[PDB]
Amino acid sequence: ACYCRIPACIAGEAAYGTCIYQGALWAFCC
């Protein structure tokens, strides 16, 4: 599974780009 997160990816996750969702920019994390 991957996730859109604010402010950042959590433990054991790495960032692969961004999400644009509900008018904000999120980290795209897997």
Resolution of the coordinates in A? 1.6
Contact 2, 27 (CB under 8 A): no
Query: For residue 3, what are its two tokens?
Result: 């996730």
Expt. technique: X-ray
Burial call 1-30: b when 16+ CB within 10 Å, e when fewer? eeeeeeeebeeeeeeeeebeeeeeebbbbe
3-state secondary structure 1-30: CCEEECCCCCCCCCEEEEEEECCEEEEEEC
Query: For residue 29, what are its two tokens?
Result: 């994390």
